[PDB]
């Protein structure tokens, strides 16, 4: 019956997705890698990539079919995807010690990890005749109305999905499969709003959510915020970095800070949202001339992840970020991109709501905001390897 359902669902596909699926059956790894890191380029390459049409039609085919109930999936995942740089056990070893289990449990206590690519999954437990490439097994509960495309292989049937969410691990236990120890993790999907390339859709959402926000502001504070974001945001942030109220207190800027904070506090974000901000080395306590800014050698990336991944963050100033993820000529030289998930109910406002050029879809957050970094990944950008940071805003 599963084969018949797969045949039925694949019959109604049109041709373009037909050769897309056929090409996926032989070049899975490269297509998956491209789909993982595709939205961090300029507007030119994304339209100019040789695989953009492939990805578009594959995504459409996947999104054609959706499930009406939550259901479970099973797949093997590398522990490196969950910010674990060590090895649980070798591929020839049979057992995992208590120390490695404890370390892996400690690494994933309270964190959320984002998955952003294609993946082959199974609707049944991995019994005999399957492959066990990693010592980590995932029991993932997919939410309602998510894409799921069953396609018949040469002999068996396999299913492909598109990851667009962030998952958290509840419990991990050690199990035995055919005389080898594995780690089984029960994970749940946490929903969030992400506009990877639909910058138009994100802008429309910002309009629909914050166009009337300005009408809720008292005119004096409204004009205050407008003029400040227009001209003096640089000065305010520069004053805030130096801990101005601590060193040289002055009310001419404390009033500005309070007004901006109250304006942001007036209307909070209603739904979980992801924002992309191109950060600089000066933010991370580095300089452009610093040797660690060269992310081409593996040693620099490894040291940066060792000393920064999994730690916290704190910005005394305000944070300006864009809903879209595509690179711009304004921040072309910045090698670090900050990926931030905004929990529902947190303070923040859409600056671009007001008419005119209010910014690059800018979003403001309250001062003294703190973040937790979960994982760090690197993607190629022309002739240099740039770096991506996943962070979660915390109250």
Partner 1 sequence: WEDEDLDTDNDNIPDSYERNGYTIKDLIAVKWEDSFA
Partner 2 sequence: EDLDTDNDNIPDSYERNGYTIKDLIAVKWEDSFAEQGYKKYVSNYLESNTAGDPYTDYEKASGSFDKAIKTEARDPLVAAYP
Partner 3 sequence: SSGQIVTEGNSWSDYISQIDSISASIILDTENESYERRVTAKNLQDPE
Binder of residue 178, out of partner 3, partner 2, partner 1, none (CB less than 5 to 8 A by kind) = partner 2
Task: Kindly write out the interface string for residues 51-90 of this chain, putting x where it contacts partner 2 by CB under 8 A and - elsewhere.
Answer: -----------------xxxx------------------x
Closer by beta carbon to partner 3, 22 or else 212: 22
* Binding at 144: pick from partner 3, partner 1, partner 2, none (beta carbon under 5-8 Å per type): partner 2
Let me know: does 8 contact 349? Beta carbons within 8 Å.
Answer: no
123 binds, among partner 1, partner 3, partner 2, none (CB under 5 to 8 A by kind): partner 3
Of the candidate spans 169-177, 210-218, 241-249, 327-335, the one that interacts with partner 1 by CB under 8 A turns out to be 169-177
Least Å from the CB of residue 172 to partner 1: 7
Q: 30-53 burial by CB neighbour count: b if 16+ within 10 A, else e?
A: ebeebbebbbbbeeeebeeeebee
Contact flag: residue 180 with partner 2 (CB under 8 A): yes
Task: Return the DSSP state at 385.
Answer: E
Nearest Cα neighbor of 175 from 204, 139, 211, 209 is: 139
The structure tokens listed for 309 are: 């991944």
Between CA 279 and CA 352 the distance in angstroms is: 20
User: Which residues neighbour 54 within 8 Å (Cβ) at sequence distance 6 or greater?
Assistant: 20, 23, 31
Residue-level length of the chain: 395
Of the candidate spans 85-93, 172-180, 231-239, 280-288, the one that interacts with partner 1 by CB under 8 A turns out to be: 172-180
Q: Is 317 annotated as a binding residue?
A: yes
What is the footprint of partner 1 within residues 66-105 (CB under 8 A)? 98, 101
Q: What are phi and psi of 268, to 5 degrees?
A: -90, 165
Whether the CB-CB separation of 389 and 378 falls below 8 Å is answered with no
d(CA 233, CA 238): 8
Q: Considering beta carbons, is residue 11 or 90 the nearer one to partner 2?
A: 90
Minimum CB separation from partner 1 for residue 129, in Å?
17
| Contact status, residue 203 vs residue 323, Cβ threshold 8 Å | yes
Q: How far apart are CA 305 and CA 296, in angstroms?
A: 14
| Interface residue with partner 1, options 87, 175, 235, 303 (CB under 8 A) | 175
State which residue, 53 or 66, has the beta carbon closest to partner 2: 66
For residue 181, give both structure tokens. Answer: 């120890």
The sign of the dihedral angle between the CA atoms of 334, 340, 346, 351 is: positive
Contact set with partner 3 (CB under 8 A): 2, 11-12, 14-15, 69, 71, 123-124, 128-129, 155-156
Which residues are documented as binding site for Zn(2+)?
A: 95, 181, 367
Which residues are documented as binding site for NADPH?
A: 233, 237, 277-278, 282-283, 317, 334
Residues that bind partner 2 (CB under 8 A): 68-71, 90, 92-95, 141, 144, 176, 178-181
Which residues are documented as binding site for NAD(+)?
A: 277-278, 282, 317, 334
């Amino acid at each position: 019956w599963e084969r018949k359902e797969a045949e039925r669902i694949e019959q109604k596909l049109e041709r373009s997705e037909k050769e897309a699926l056929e090409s996926y059956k032989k070049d899975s790894v490269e297509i998956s890698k491209y789909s993982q890191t595709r939205n961090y380029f300029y507007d030119y390459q994304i339209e100019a990539n040789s695989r953009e049409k492939e990805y578009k039609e594959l995504r459409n085919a996947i999104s054609k079919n959706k499930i009406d109930k939550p259901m479970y999936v099973y797949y093997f995942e590398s522990p490196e995807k969950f910010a674990f740089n060590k090895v649980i056990r070798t591929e020839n070893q049979n057992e995992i010690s208590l120390e490695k289990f404890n370390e892996f449990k400690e690494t994933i206590q309270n964190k959320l990890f984002k998955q952003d690519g294609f993946k082959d999954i199974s609707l049944y437990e991995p019994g005999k005749g399957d492959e066990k490439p990693t010592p980590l097994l995932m029991h993932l509960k997919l939410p309602r109305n998510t894409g799921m495309l069953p396609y018949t292989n040469t002999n068996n049937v396999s299913t492909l999905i598109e990851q667009g969410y962030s998952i958290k691990i509840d419990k991990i236990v050690r199990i035995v499969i055919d005389g080898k120890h594995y780690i089984k993790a029960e994970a749940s999907v946490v929903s969030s709003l992400d506009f990877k390339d639909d910058v138009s859709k994100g802008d429309s959402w910002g309009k629909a959510n914050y166009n009337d926000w300005s009408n809720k502001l008292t005119p004096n504070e409204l004009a205050d915020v407008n003029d400040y974001m227009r001209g003096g945001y640089t000065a305010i942030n520069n004053y805030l970095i130096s801990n101005g109220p601590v060193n040289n207190p002055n009310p001419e800027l404390d009033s500005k800070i309070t007004n901006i904070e109250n304006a942001l506090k007036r209307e909070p974000i209603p739904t979980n949202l992801t924002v992309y901000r191109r950060s600089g080395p000066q933010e991370f306590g580095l300089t452009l001339t610093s040797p660690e800014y060269d992310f081409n050698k593996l040693e620099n990336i490894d040291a940066f992840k060792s000393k920064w991944e999994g730690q916290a963050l704190s910005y005394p100033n305000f944070i300006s970020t864009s809903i879209g993820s595509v690179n711009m000529s304004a921040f072309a030289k910045r090698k670090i991109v900050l990926r931030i998930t905004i929990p529902k109910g947190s303070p923040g406002a859409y600056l671009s709501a007001i008419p005119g050029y209010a910014g690059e879809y800018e979003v403001l957050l309250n001062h003294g905001s703190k973040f937790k970094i979960n994982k760090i990944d690197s993607y190629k950008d022309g002739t240099i390897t740039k770096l991506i940071v996943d962070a979660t805003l915390i109250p």
